[PDB]
Structure formats: C-alpha cells, structure tokens
Design a protein around this ligand. Sequence first.
Ligand SMILES: Nc1ncnc2c1ncn2[C@@H]1O[C@H](COP(=O)(O)OP(=O)(O)O)[C@@H](O)[C@H]1O
Ligand SMILES: Nc1ncnc2c1ncn2[C@@H]1O[C@H](COP(=O)(O)OP(=O)(O)O)[C@@H](O)[C@H]1O
Ligand SMILES: Nc1ncnc2c1ncn2[C@@H]1O[C@H](COP(=O)(O)OP(=O)(O)O)[C@@H](O)[C@H]1O
Ligand SMILES: Nc1ncnc2c1ncn2[C@@H]1O[C@H](COP(=O)(O)OP(=O)(O)O)[C@@H](O)[C@H]1O
Ligand SMILES: [Mg+2]
Ligand SMILES: [Mg+2]
Lengths: 459, 488, 459, 493
Amino acid sequence: MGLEALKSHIMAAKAVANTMRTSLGPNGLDKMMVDKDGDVTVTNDGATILSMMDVDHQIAKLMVELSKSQDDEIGDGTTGVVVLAGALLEEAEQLLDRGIHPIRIADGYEQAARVAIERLDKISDSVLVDIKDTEPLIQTAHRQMAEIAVNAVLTVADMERRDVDFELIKVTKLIKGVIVDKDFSHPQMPKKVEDAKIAILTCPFEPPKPKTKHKLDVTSVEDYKALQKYEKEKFEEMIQQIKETGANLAICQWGFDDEANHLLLQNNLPAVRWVGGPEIELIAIATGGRIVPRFSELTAEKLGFAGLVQEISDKMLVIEQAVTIFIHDALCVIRNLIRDNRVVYGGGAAEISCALAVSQEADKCPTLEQYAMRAFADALEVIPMALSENSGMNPIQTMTEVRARQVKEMNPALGIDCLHKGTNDMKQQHVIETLIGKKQQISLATQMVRMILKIDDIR
Amino acid sequence: LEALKSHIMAAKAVANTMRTSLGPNGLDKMMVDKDGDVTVTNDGATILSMMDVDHQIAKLMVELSKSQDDEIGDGTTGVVVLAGALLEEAEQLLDRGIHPIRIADGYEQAARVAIERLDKISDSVLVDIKDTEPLIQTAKSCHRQMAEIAVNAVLTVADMERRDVDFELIKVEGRLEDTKLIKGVIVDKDFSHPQMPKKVEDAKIAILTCPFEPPKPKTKHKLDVTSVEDYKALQKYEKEKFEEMIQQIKETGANLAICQWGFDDEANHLLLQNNLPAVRWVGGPEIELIAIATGGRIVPRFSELTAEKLGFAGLVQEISFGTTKDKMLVIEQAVTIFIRGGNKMIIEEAKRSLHDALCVIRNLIRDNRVVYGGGAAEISCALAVSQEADKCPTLEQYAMRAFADALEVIPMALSENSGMNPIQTMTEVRARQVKEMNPALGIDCLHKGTNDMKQQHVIETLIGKKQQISLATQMVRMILKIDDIRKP
Amino acid sequence: MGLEALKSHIMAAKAVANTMRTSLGPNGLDKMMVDKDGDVTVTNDGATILSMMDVDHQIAKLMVELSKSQDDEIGDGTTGVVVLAGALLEEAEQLLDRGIHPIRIADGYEQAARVAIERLDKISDSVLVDIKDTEPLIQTAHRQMAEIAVNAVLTVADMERRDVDFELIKVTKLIKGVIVDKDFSHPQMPKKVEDAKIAILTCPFEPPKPKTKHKLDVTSVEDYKALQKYEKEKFEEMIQQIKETGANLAICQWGFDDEANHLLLQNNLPAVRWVGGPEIELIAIATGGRIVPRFSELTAEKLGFAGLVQEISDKMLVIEQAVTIFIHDALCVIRNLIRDNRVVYGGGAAEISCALAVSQEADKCPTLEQYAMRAFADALEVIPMALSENSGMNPIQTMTEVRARQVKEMNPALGIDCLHKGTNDMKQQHVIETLIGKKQQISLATQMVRMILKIDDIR
Amino acid sequence: LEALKSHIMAAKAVANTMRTSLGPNGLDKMMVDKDGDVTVTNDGATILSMMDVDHQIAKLMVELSKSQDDEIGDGTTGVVVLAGALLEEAEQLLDRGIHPIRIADGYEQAARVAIERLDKISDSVLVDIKDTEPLIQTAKSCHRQMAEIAVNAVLTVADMERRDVDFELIKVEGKVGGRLEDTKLIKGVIVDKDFSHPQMPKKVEDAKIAILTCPFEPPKPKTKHKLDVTSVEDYKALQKYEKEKFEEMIQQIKETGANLAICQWGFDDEANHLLLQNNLPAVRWVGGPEIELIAIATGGRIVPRFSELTAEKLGFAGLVQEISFGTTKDKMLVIEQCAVTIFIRGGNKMIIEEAKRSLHDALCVIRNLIRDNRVVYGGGAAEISCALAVSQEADKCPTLEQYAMRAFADALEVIPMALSENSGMNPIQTMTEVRARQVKEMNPALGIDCLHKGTNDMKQQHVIETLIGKKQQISLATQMVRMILKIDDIRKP
Ligand SMILES: Nc1ncnc2c1ncn2[C@@H]1O[C@H](COP(=O)(O)OP(=O)(O)O)[C@@H](O)[C@H]1O
Ligand SMILES: Nc1ncnc2c1ncn2[C@@H]1O[C@H](COP(=O)(O)OP(=O)(O)O)[C@@H](O)[C@H]1O
Ligand SMILES: Nc1ncnc2c1ncn2[C@@H]1O[C@H](COP(=O)(O)OP(=O)(O)O)[C@@H](O)[C@H]1O
Ligand SMILES: Nc1ncnc2c1ncn2[C@@H]1O[C@H](COP(=O)(O)OP(=O)(O)O)[C@@H](O)[C@H]1O
Ligand SMILES: [Mg+2]
Ligand SMILES: [Mg+2]
C-alpha cells in the first residue's frame, strides 16, 4: 500500500524490538531457539539471535545485517541497536500522526544523532596503552583472559598507527600462531615439514575423462589390472606436478582414499584431506597461498611460505607468511580501544546524558525538527527503562530519579545499578562501553530508522 | 468508450505509484527480483525496468519510458508523472464530450508551444575548456574528481567536428580517491594458466562463441573400448583434434584468442606448447565488448573463419590487484571508466551518479544549453501554453489549458515530496514568475535555500526537457487512441 | 437452429463490423492486439487486424479471408468491406422482420450492387500513363516514394496489354533485382558466381541408412576414423553429383555444419544454408529453378539461370531468369491504375453518389426488391457516417448536408472533410480510391451478405 | 485496566468527531431527529444536545458539557476537543507505566497553572456606554445591529446596581419569513397562539390580564355517576344549567377588571362562544413557560382558581395585539408593567436558527462580562500562552507529575492546531511558527488568523473570549478527564 505500509513497517520492526527488549542487560532472557532437526541454544546477546529467527517481513529481515554486519563485526553491543531503532520508530509514529513528513523526521534524527555523538566526546574518559591497564580493564568481560587477550591482540596490531586488524584470531594455553585439526593422513610421513611450500588445491584427483561415446569394455587381468595401473600412473603425473612447482606438503579437498595416499608417501608429498572453505582459506590467508581450481594446472608463485608444520596428538603450523587462541567478547573491545582509547560509562548513563544534550539543544530549534529531536531524546531514554524493567525495578521511577541526579550532581555516569547490588554510581563496577561502540550504535540505529522512513510501497 | 477510461485509470495508477519518488526526496522502492538480490533506488529509471508487467497500458508505460529518455537523457520519473497527469485531465475533457483525437491534436499543439518556450528560457554554456567541470558538481569532497573523469571520458570519445554524438564506449567495473583514469576498455579473469605470455602487444583477437570438441559423426554409434591403448589412443585422438584446431586458428593471425564454453582438461596446456594464449570463458558481455572495441566481428564456427575478422588491438596486459588478478587491454581499433572504492556500496552509488554525468555531458555536447530545474521551467512552460490557449478558439482551447495544468503537477509533486503545501507554494511561485519576470525560481526544494534556483545551480539541460515533453505527449497520444486490446 | 441462426449470424457478423467501425478513416483507433508470448502491434487498416483476432463464430471467421484474400491481395481498402457487410446485414434484419424472404434480399442486393458499380463508371475520372502524373498521384500514400514505386512497377509490368503482375516485389536505395540475406557460409569461397546454375535442394545430407537391425559396434581408431572418413566420402558423392548436373552455387535447407562445408570449398561448390519456404521459393520463382526433394537424385533441367550472384556486408543476385525494393500501400494502387486508369474520389463521396443512384433507381421498382435496394442505399451511407463520427463530427448532420449538396451542386466529389481542415470539396486534398478498389469492395461485401443470407442450420 | 483504554478511545472518538466543527470554519453535521425535521449547526452545544447518545462515557461528556458550560458559559466544542486531547496524551502516559491517579494529579496542577496564567494575559473592557457593542462582533455580515440589540437586551434587564447577576425573563421567537436585516427593536414580551374566535377584538388596549391555570368547565362530583336525562324538558334543563354556570365565571372575572383573560388547559366547546357574547377575549392554551413570562411581566399573580380571585392580581398592560405572519398568526403585546423579548424574521427557514444561536452567544458573552469584565484574545492565543507557561512549570518539576504537565501542555495546543486545519492551513507548521512568534515578540495575543484575512496579530480583529469562559473551559475539561481517568469496570447492569 501507499502510506499505511509505513505504519506497517513501524509495527513490523518494533515487533522485533519488543521481541529482544527482554534480553537486554545482564538479566536478559535466554530464548530457546532450536533449528529444524538441531538442538537448543539458550543465550542472551541478540547478536546470535538475529542470525537465527525467521525472515518474516522484509523490514524485519532489514533489522538483521544492519544490527549484525556492523556491530557484530565492528563493535560488540547488538541488542541496543535494534531496541533503539524500534523506539525511534515508535516516536516517529506519533510524529507522523501529528502531520510531520517522514523525510523531515529522518533529517531531524540525523541532526539529533550528531548532537549525541559529539557529546560522547565530552562524556569520554581516556585510558592509557602499551602495558597493564588494559588487562585490569578486561575483567569486565577469570584473571588470565585479560592477559592472553591483551598480548594476543598486541602481537597482531598496526599500532603505528591507524590501529586496525581482524581476522587473524579464532579458537587453556598460550599460542604461537594459527592451528588446524586432522592429520596429514598416513603417519609414515614426516611430522617435520619445516620450510613448507603449501599447495592449496580445491579439486578432484581423477584421470581426465575424454568427451566421446565411452562405454569401456574390459576382460579380466589383461585390461583391468592395466586400468588400475593406468590411473595410478596418472596419479603420479599430478604428484610429479606438485613437486615441480614448490615442494613438501599440500592441502586438498574432496577425495583421496584408495592406494593414492600410499603413493604420495613414496614420493615424499605429505598432503592433507579433506576440508571445505574453512581451514582452506584459513591457511590461504595465513601462509601464501591463493587457491588453485586445478587439478595439476598451476604455477608457484601461489604456494605459501609457512616456516614450521608439525603434528601432535591435530597438526599445527607456526611461523607464517597471524596468531590464534586455543582453549569472544573483549577481543573486539580491545580493538576499539586500539582505535580510540576513550571510554564512556554504560548502564544507560551515556544514553541519559546524550538525551539531556539532544533535548537541551532541541529547546532552541525552529520549524519541525524540534519535535524530531525531542522524540530522539525520548528514544534514547528507552535503554535505561528497559534495563530497569528487566531487573524488576519500576521503569519510569528509577529512570526519572537518575535523569534528575545527573543534572544536579553533574555526573554523566550514575544510572541503573543494575545488578541490585551497588551504589548506582556506575563509576565503580567499572562498566564501560568504549567510544566506537556507542557512536557506531547510534549511527546504525539512525541509519535503520532513516531507511525505513524513506521506504514506501515496496511490493 | 469505457476502454479509454480504463487505460486512463490504469496508467495514472503507475504515475501515482512513482509520484512520491520524484525529486531528491524520493522513497527508494525496495523491489526484489526473481531468486536474486535487491536493488534500492529512487529515480524511476530502475523502477520501470522492474515492478509488474500487468496491463498492456502499464507495459506500454514502460519501454516507451525505458529506452528513450533513460538512453538519451537522464530524467525518467518525470516523464511518467507528466503522462499520468495528462491522462487525469484528459478524463475530465472526455467527460465534456470531446473526442480523443481532438485532445491528442490539442496536446500536440500545446507541447509545441512549450518546447518553443524552452529555447526562450535557455542559458548557454561554453565547451572545449572547463565550464563543464564546475557544472557537474550538481549531479551528485566526493564531487571534485567525478566531474573531471567524466569530462575527459566524453572528451576523448566524441565526434566534436561536429554533429556531436557518441555512446556507448563507457562503462565501470566496481576508496573513491583511488578511482583511476582510464586508457581503454578493461576486463577481468585471466588468460588461464600464468605460464602464458602477459605481453600480447599487436594482438590479433579471435572471437569464438563456438565449443571446442572433436567432430562427432552422425551415424548409429555405440562406441566401445578394449582399454590398454584403445583408451589412451582415444585420448591421443582428441588431443590431435585439439592440436588440429590450435594451429588452424594460428593460420590467419595468432596472438591471443577469446572463447566461450569448454576448455578444461590439458587442452590449454597444448595451446601453451603452440603459443596461443587464449581466454575463457564469458558470455554476451566481453564477447561483444571486445568485439565492438577491437575488430573483431564474431565467429560462430568451428573450422570456418578468415582474418579479416581479427581485431588489431595494440596492447594486452595482465595486472594483479592484491591477491586475485585481472587482465586489461589498451590501444584499440575507445575508453571505459574504472572504480574501486571498497565496501561495495561506495560503488554503485558513484556509478549511478556518474551515469548522470555522461548523459548530461552528451546532452550538452549535442546542444549546449540549460534550463533551470526544480519545476520552474515547467511553470514558465505552463504560463506559455495557457497564454496561447486564451487566444485560441474551438476545442483545442480546452486541450491546451489541460496540458498546462498537467505541466504544473511536477512543481506540485516536487512540493509535496519535500513537505511543503503542494498547490499553495506552486501558485505563489507561478505568481513570482510573472511579477519578477524570472523563468528560474521555484520549489526550494531541499527545504534550505533562497528559492531562486539560479543559485543551487540545478540544470536539466535542453534535450532532457524537450525529450521529456515529446515523449509524454507521444505516450499520451497513443493511449488516448487505441481501444479493444484483442489478446488472442 | 433453423431460422434464428440467421439473426444469430447477423449479430455475430455485425459484431465484427462494430469492432472495426472505429478504425475506419484516418482518425481510426490502433487496437493493441498482442499474440501469446509476442509483443504489441498498434495500427489502423483492418487488413492486418483480420489476420489476428480470433476464430469466434464460423461466420466471424467467414468475415476474414473474404475481406482478406481479395482486397488485401487485389485492392487495398479492407475495413470498408467489413463495415459495409455489417451494415447490409443490419438493414437485411429489418427487411427479414418485415416478412421478406432472405434469398429475395440477396438478389435485391445483387441488382443494387449492379447499379452502384455501373455508376462508378459515370463518377470515374481518367488519369494519364507512361510518364510523370502517376508520381504526383502517389503523394496521397515523402517525395521519392512515388518515383521509386513508379519505376519499380514500370520495370515489372505487362503493359501491352492485359496489365497484370505480382508478386516480384518485397523488401533507401534503388534496386536491380531480388535480394537475400545470410552468406554462402565460409568466406574463402568465391564472391563472384556470375552465370550461376542454382541447385535448389530442400533435403538432408546424410549417408543413406539401410533398413535392418542395426546397432553399430566400433573399437577406437580402426573402425571409428573409418566411419568419419566414410561419411565424408559419401558427402563427396553428393558434391560430385551436384556438379555433374549444373555447376557453381546451390541452395540448401536443414543441416550442413561439420567439416562438410569445408569439403565443398575444395570442390568449388559455394552453396548456402539454411532457410525455410521463403528465400527458397523466392529464388525458385526468380531464377529457375523448381524444387528438388532429394538428396542427390535430380536432373537439370531444374537449375536456375541467374546471371550474377555477389556478396556484400547479405549476398544478392542480379540478372534473373523480377525487381524488389530495398530500404506497402501505393504499390497495389499503381497496379490497379495499370489495369484501369480511372479513379473516383473517396472520403465516402463515391458511396453517397452510389446511394443516390441506387435509391433513384429503387423508386421505380415492383415487388419486394424495392425495399432491398433502398436498404442497400442506406447501407452504403454508413461509410460517410462512420467517417464523420471517427473524427468527432455529428454523423447524420454532416452526412445529410453533404447528400443534399451533391444533388444541388451536381458534384459526386465533396463529402466528409475529414481531417477537420479543408474545403470539403474532396477534389482538392487529392483523395482517390481508383476504380477496381471500390468495384471490388462492393462486389465482395455483397458476396459476403449473400453468402450469410443463404446459410442456415450449419451445425 | 483496558476498560480505561476503551473509555479513552470512545471519548477521543467523540472529540475527533467535533474537532472539525471548531472555530468559525467548522462543519455542520446533518443531524436529523425522530420523525421530524433536520438541524445543521456548528457550536457543539446543540450537537451534544442531540448527537448519538450511546456510550456511558460519551453520556458523561454530554452530562458535564451541559452541566456547567452550556448552562453558564458559551464555548462547548472546545471542552470536548481539549478533553479528547488530554485523554489521547494520558493514554501514552498510561503505557509509560504511570498510575492514572498521578496523571490526574499532574493534570490538576497544570490546570491550576494555566488558569492562574489567564489572569496575567487578561485585558479590561469598559461598561455602561457603547463599549461592549463593537466587541460582540466576535460571536458571529449582519453584525452591526445584532450587537446593538444584544447589549440593549442584556443591559435593560440586569441587576446592574450592582451584584451583577441576571438572566432569563428574556426569550427569542423567530417567525420565519423575511431577511435577517428585518429584525426589529423590541419592547415587551411577545407570545404565540391566539385569543381564539375570529370575531374577537384583534387589538385590546389598556388590558387588565387575568392569568389562570384552570379548566373552564363546571366541576362534577366525580363519584360513580350514571347521568341519565329523562324528559326532553330535562335535556333543556341540563343545557340551561351549564349555560348559566359557564357565565357564573365570566362576570366573576369582569367584576375584578376584565378586558382579556389568559387560560391554561381547556377552553371548552361553547365557552369561547359565551366569552365573545360577554366581550371577554381570553386565550388558550399554553403551559408553564409563556405563562410565567406574562406573570412576571405584567402583574400578574397566577390564580389556581376557578371563580376565586380579586384584582389586585390583574396586571396593567398598555397594548395587546394580534398580528398575522403569512397565514398563521401570533398575538404580541407592547407597553407592559415590566421584561423584553427579541424577534427575528430571517426567511428561508434555515436563515433563522442561525440568528438564534448567534444571538444567544451575545447574551451569554455580555452576561459573563457584567459578572467579571475581563477578556483574553481567542484564536487559540490564550491556549498557546497557557501551554508555554505549563511547559515552563513542567521543566522545573520532578517525579511523575512532570510528564503529566508536559502532556497537558501539548494537549492545550490542539485548539490552535484544530483551528489551523479547519481553515486549510498546515496544522503543525503555522502553530509552531506562532508559538515561536509569541516568545520572540512576547505578545500573548497573535495566532491563527483565522479568517485567512488579516495581520495574524489578533490584537486587531478583536477576538475576545472573556475570562470565565476560558477558566470554566479548562476547569470543566480537567474535571471530565479527571473522572474518565478514574472509573473502571463500567458495571451497567
Ligand atoms: N554490569 C552492568 N550494569 C549495568 N548495565 C550493564 C552491565 N553490563 C552490561 N550492561 C548493559 O547491557 C546492555 C546490552 O548488553 P547485552 O544485553 O549483553 O547485549 P548487547 O551487548 O549485544 O547489547 C549494554 O548497553 C550495557 O549498558
Ligand atoms: N537540487 C534540486 N532542487 C530541486 N529539484 C531538483 C533538484 N535536483 C533534482 N530536482 C528535480 O527532480 C526531478 C526528477 O529527478 P529524479 O526524481 O532524480 O528522477 P528523474 O531524474 O529520473 O526524473 C527533476 O525534474 C528535477 O527538477
Ligand atoms: N484524406 C482523407 N480524407 C477523407 N477520407 C479518407 C482520407 N484518406 C482515407 N480516407 C478514407 O478511409 C477509408 C478507409 O481507409 P482505412 O481506414 O485506412 O482502411 P482501409 O483502407 O483498409 O479501408 C477509405 O474509404 C477512404 O475513403
Ligand atoms: N474570528 C475568529 N478568529 C479566530 N478564532 C475564532 C474566531 N471566532 C471564534 N474563534 C474560535 O472558535 C473557537 C470555538 O468557537 P465555536 O467553534 O463557535 O464553538 P464553541 O464556542 O462552542 O467552542 C474559540 O476557541 C475561538 O478561539
Ligand atoms: Mg534527476
Ligand atoms: Mg461558539
């Protein structure tokens, strides 16, 4: 429909926001979430929830990947993005009914977002780098996790400067590089492949069948044993091909089986089989190594320069042309701190101070953007309320009292305990959301709401 | 008669659909397609290419709107709204008892008046030295280089003395600051098997849409093989046939070849031993692209060609961009733009804004004049048509006025999409146009500015408007005729 | 049914007449007319409309091919035939209800048709031949069209006398003969085939498979390569067969492909492939050439004596045993003028004067044919009315005033402007329908109405 | 709780029905009734007087809208629109988690704020000389003499020295036929009906009136009778008896002064006969109203009898006449003992009923001004400034009443918004621009033209709403919203 499709999108998106409004904060609800013949997965943190669920309305699916591809791949806090977007749409409904044009509301939300974002610069608190401090800053996310995370991201970093990196990390011991499971297949092969030229091949190993009316006919010994011998020789063709360009180990998908793996032992070519995309592209990005669609047709070039490759009872390679932990959260936070070392206190406090700023700046504004900015303020104030109700406290009561204590005490920190044990100051408990986390959160929520507001008709 | 009114309503439905997407405040239209991805753009040029082929009048609304303004000018969403309004008023004129042939002829006469008035509003812009560069910043600091690269793109490829027409040699292959100038048309993929030479200078290109397979005879077959060397000699057989095709292509010109369909196997290896670095494999594009670019005709066979056909492209190279590689050729018997901005959405935005640059520059090269947009040219044209209708008798008198009121929908649509009052601001602007004698000002439209439209520098060129009006009136002339719709 | 089937046929045919009553004259309506998965085709001139549409009632299909096979293949004006037929049936309905027998009405329509036809001799106006005049007479159907059409039909004409010819013309440049597209396939062949004996063969090129339990069995080199070589030799059989009777180029449908086309080059036999009926029968009627169902079994005899055959980037042949234009309407008109050089003015004027004649002769008539002839007059007067309403004028008003001005001014010319700009005299505007066009039109319409009137029961 | 949302939705439905009839550009509402004629009017007072009485909450809004405003003040439509707005906002406050009693408390406090603010915006209007006349032009192009007759009507009949409370003893009668400028200056009270009989004296001057609520028939025992008349002589005896006892009451009235009498209830068959022959043109018949009018005007001491009276009671009227308007006739009298009544001849049948309500607005306005002579400027201006003050007090208040006060502030602004949309202007745009021009220019007067002709300043156009009109409007609105915000379960046995 023409316009009422807009209110329909508001309803459809705020439906999602209300679905995950309970899973916000530490007292969130787990959501059973099975999958077809699969099993149960009960967790907070909507990041993994948005991956699941269903494609209901294309706006409800638009809620995903805007809350995922950025905040899950850049920041950490996902649930706040969708909750905020839903609230903004809820107030934009009252503004629509009042007679305000949608695009004016989107613009007002942009300007208000500028006000809040620029504040977060004023609320910010810097943290030192290069030793310690970061470690005791991770206990928020029990002791060694901080240390291992620190040195893990310290080893893999730009640092001078530009301050960006990912993805060289995945999965208690320390770590020297990236590691893989499985084996080179047939332990008679050497376990010491140091200085290895890795041949990454996603292909089959078969005699190149010609294209013609085929139907082979064979009579016992004579032709049959000559067939087995034939494709064994043709296998030696590929074997001697991999050793001409490069040397030592290779990596292969699909089939091996048969004798085959035997022959490569006699030719000293300890390959590995078999795995799909992961562990292929892993060793590809790690050492070398590009990818070969063939099947014996390649130049190297391609092969990777991995320094050490060993086997322990899962084979692991070190010294790569890249360090990966062995047994999420803080690993992203540290990255943000590497980008900008400032933090703002969480628990909805930054939202409250941002709301006070957007509203204080909205009182002096002409035309219609005034109401848009005020609606934005009331939208940011949904985080403290949701946080309050998820723990059982009276929403508007605790929220209002805090919003007053922030201007009287001049403290953009205190607000929503929330754990029902504490001094409410939020300075203690050390609850920090960094800077890029919140700035990206607001930018993403406003981007969503603007998009939905522009859309109309749309099938 | 009711068939006509059915057409009226059915077409004004399309117009009323895309009436909200007009102007810079368009509403984007999701529009998924088939089993594939989505494409979100206002600017109805992409919206007519999708949606639903429902009524033959809505169909006719497309492909008259698709390949005429979108392939000559740039404005498209305006044409359909103009036609829709023309039919909305044409319904009123049908109720009065006027025959549709009379409303069509009247619409033609009125359209002539409007087109002739456009020349009166025109403002000239010089060519051959800048002046266009500062003129393209309006089409989208991501605006500085776009004007430049587009300028030299159409300057390198143009008739220029004179007649001033050229298209199509320009395309784009997806930071913007890393967007590169261009020396020719460029391709992706590889020549297959990097053992091949990367310097194919003075290349004779052999374009083959054929498959490479030994000629299977036509007879009851059931081929059987006793193995040992009955199998190996079959391999050697079609290896000898592949080899028989290799030097058969090398007979008239060698260098590189371009092919579709299958290769695989060793095959390419044999071609390396004979030194024929071909490429594989691509469909319509890059077959016709390199055909029109260098040489080169097309060879459907399969043991039937002479050269003749082969293209005399000067240089062909392979460049590695990061890890994966792409091969690109220069010096052709011809230049095409290239962009890489990362994030994948930083392009397709630059592309859609760049196409407007080539279109506007080509329109300015054909005739170097502009009229100020924002619906003001429509208002001055409406005042012209109506001024002509007050001094005309009989029935065309009413048709012309209906045409005027139909031209005033663009300022109204531009006003309503920005949140202003549609008829109020429209009437106020039309007043200030005769009072101040200024065929320029009207519809802010961005809600920020001085309303003068002389500033903000919004230009629709000339053939943009002339084609928009001529096409809207041509469409309406068609729909106003016809009836029945057989559909066997 | 017995009789009411007659009124049903009247309704069914006048339904068609009313369908195309709007598309008459210059202000006709285009009619969308798609076709299954095809595209749109919007034009006046019902000639191409009757080809489309649908087979509804066998009388509605009887309306076709009587309006097509003659007036589209002889005259030009198709829509007037069906409109007239419908009107005649409409009046024949009132005559039926009055108590008149059908066959009497058909006879009366015949006699009335004689009156009108014989008039057209009195209304006629002669036009000179052999130079010019015809050219400025074609601008009705912008300058060169008259010239090219004139000399095109001048080159192909009997002229002494009997004055008939078609079809040697089809499809800006002048023309020396009939032309074809495609190529001789494989440009190594000669482009100069002058003095060519064309071998028109619609057949395949395959080894004559014997009739017995077959199932070939082959083992690689030995028998397989001998199979390829075999059918290549068998191909040389047909090659050497075409060169024994005739020489040079041939023409073939169906398959060639393979090497095949290669071998004919080495034997100098530049044939062409492949096309269906058209371009086969075109070169057949042009040069020579009959048609050979075989497949190597023929005597020549058959082959055509085309003088020149060349190739330009589409191969074209000249000097044939026949001239065709290169880039409809006037080409038929000129033919009629070649048959009879007289013309009558159109725009319904000839219909009005014919009506005045049939009615003037009907006033003095006994028995029932009186009413039949009068109905015929009122039937011819539908052309000026339809012409009037299609432009928007008052039908009966303009029609009546003209029918009066024709007897007062004694001018079988003026009537229906129709373009809303002119002096109504019809002498100017130079609107001419020749003679055979109108005479054939009336004869065909009366033939239709007579047929329908005779028919009854009929399944 | 959802019972409250049902009430809030129905009440806002009524409000949305009448927010299009707000202001001078308001709409009509066909409003037919029973088996009778139709009535199309603005001014929701009559709308609420009929409407469609369905939901008990709508019934409550009618109850309280007529309870105070229609019976004392003037503005009624504004009350229901404002109440509707306050409810529309209090709904979102309910969803926010606030308790209803707290919302009603905040609405009360904010209401007191606005009420106290109207005094600061107030302006003064003089009395006693031709100053109110030019200020009646707001109530309605026939104004020039409408205002004149209005002030004349209310000032002639008023306490005035002092006490400043007076109403009634004045009515209006439209006789349908003429043009609105045919309205005439008025003297005494005027009633319909007729003396009955055509041979009656049609102009009785210097009349001493006898107002009676009694039947004219000689009473009967009302025991269980079977009255059977025997001889024909007794037939004549009966007729003679009642012929005499009908007269026993006639000269009984004439001994205390006669001229014309006045009767309720029955005026019998002969009766009027016997009264013509005795030259006593009485009249029949009318209920309580129009009886007490002539009672207070002249004399008159209504007599419950029936042959028992001494005069004394009879009044002193100078002239009584019977005038025929078209076909039907009404008898009107001049020169009373004093009591004035207005007369309207508008024609077209629909041109009257407009002048009656438009005049009623005049009497009410002038009465309110006599009670307290203060005015605030209309067109939503007082509403805008009131909203400004309420939001000002709201920014400085903590806890939950804060939100309720802000909701009240936004709820006041519906009057300028409704006034805006009903005139064709952009509702929120013009209203917002005016709310800015009221703080920048510091002028609690300008806003909403509303006639689309003027300087928007509203100081000119002199649109006045008095003070008790606004104070009672806000008090009644907040009273309604207070009641509706409580009340659950809606029993309704
Ligand atoms: N100790 C804490 N006290 C108060 N609030 C907290 C605390 N820890 C986390 N939060 C709040 O929880 C919110 C959302 O976190 P969560 O519900 O885990 O999902 P996500 O991080 O994906 O939004 C954050 O905005 C943060 O303010
Ligand atoms: N800066 C601007 N201010 C006012 N109007 C504009 C501006 N830019 C473009 N327009 C108007 O938008 C109209 C339509 O453009 P658009 O909606 O992009 O689709 P299309 O160009 O295909 O019609 C044009 O007629 C033009 O007048
Ligand atoms: N310039 C003209 N003025 C008046 N009548 C015309 C003119 N040109 C053509 N006609 C009329 O149009 C009639 C039909 O032509 P048309 O509608 O094109 O289809 P068809 O020729 O197949 O009947 C003719 O009988 C002729 O009298
Ligand atoms: N001339 C005027 N200009 C602006 N507003 C006016 C004017 N006259 C009346 N109004 C507005 O009309 C509103 C309501 O009056 P009305 O529609 O008659 O019904 P009610 O008086 O019963 O509320 C008042 O609030 C007043 O502000
Ligand atoms: Mg545009
Ligand atoms: Mg009122």
